[PDB]
From Swiss-Prot:
Protein name stated in the entry: Uridine diphosphate glucose pyrophosphatase NUDT22
Short sequence motif Nudix box: positions: 162-183
Catalytic activity, as annotated: UDP-sugar + H2O = UMP + alpha-D-aldose 1-phosphate
Task of the protein: Hydrolyzes UDP-glucose to glucose 1-phosphate and UMP and UDP-galactose to galactose 1-phosphate and UMP. Preferred substrate is UDP-glucose.
Record EC number: 3.6.1.45
Keyword Cell inner membrane attributed: no
Length: 285
């Protein structure tokens, strides 16, 4: 529908719980060496560093692909194939001025438009309040990507190994809600995965989008958010849309306000929907 958003994975209605998801992490799922030579990446990084000497590189999971298993299987309902990448490779590929080139050559060379791209896996949440609102945040205008736009709560996953990875992805969305929205973990339910959306403005970089229920009402959430003060969050404001009004959102004037990744969350939410899960504190492991 929206050109800024393509869907990579759409989970079955109601979303998928952590317990039904497996990850496989392998060098096989890493970015392919650039044609020819990764020194294009170094050149971009060093250019970025003279402008911003403090730039910090960080490890990221790379999303290679995802496969839904046949319904009602002995195995996991979903398999995520992940590699490793970094902020530096992301700047040098997905946000390279040559990204469109790289996607076309990837498709020809490897039958994969994303082959030469870092494609770090982001995360975001459709965070629903007890009185049935979704939670939205106003991005600070100081950030590099989508400054000043509306977002949903995000997160920062940081690299039996498969289960630890799946756990880190799920924990990362709860952690970010706790940290950025200033909500007690007691009030959050186990997240459900809705699907994976691509951001076409960042050369198809994908984000896993979750559903998370909060036991607080929208007014309580707002009070918790604000009680931290300006320094307690990166965003500058919080607001709420009735869940019943989220379906029609792409025709309202708020749609132009949303960043690409928040749109992917909303689209998956509308298509897939959440389902009941218990308090996050109630699940083990």
């Amino acid at each position: 529908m929206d050109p800024e958003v393509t869907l990579l994975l759409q989970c079955p209605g109601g979303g998928l719980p952590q317990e039904q998801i497996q990850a496989e992490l392998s060098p096989a799922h890493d970015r392919r060496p650039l044609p020819g030579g990764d020194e294009a990446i170094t050149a971009i990084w060093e250019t970025r560093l003279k402008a911003q000497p403090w730039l910090f590189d960080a490890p990221k999971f790379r999303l290679h692909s995802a496969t839904l298993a046949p319904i009602g299987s002995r195995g996991p309902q979903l398999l995520l194939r992940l590699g490793l990448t970094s902020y530096r490779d992301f700047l040098g590929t997905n946000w390279s001025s040559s990204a469109a080139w790289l996607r076309q050559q990837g498709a020809t060379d490897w039958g994969d438009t994303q082959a030469y791209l870092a494609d770090p896996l982001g995360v975001g949440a459709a965070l629903a309040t007890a009185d049935d609102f979704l939670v939205f945040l106003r991005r600070s205008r100081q950030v590099a990507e989508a400054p000043g736009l509306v977002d949903v709560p995000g997160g920062h996953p940081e690299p039996l190994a498969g289960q630890l990875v799946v756990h880190e992805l799920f924990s990362s969305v709860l952690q970010e809600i706790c940290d950025e929205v200033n909500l007690p973990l007691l009030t959050l339910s186990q997240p459900l995965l809705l699907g994976i959306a691509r951001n076409e403005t960042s050369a198809g970089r994908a984000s896993a989008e979750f559903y998370v229920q909060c036991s607080l009402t929208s007014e309580q959430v707002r009070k918790h958010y604000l009680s931290g003060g300006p320094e307690a969050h990166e965003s500058t404001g919080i607001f709420f849309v009735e869940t019943q009004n989220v379906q029609r959102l792409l025709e309202t004037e708020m749609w132009a306000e949303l960043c690409p990744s928040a749109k992917g969350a909303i689209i998956l939410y509308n298509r897939v929907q959440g389902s009941p899960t218990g308090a996050a504190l109630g699940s083990p492991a």
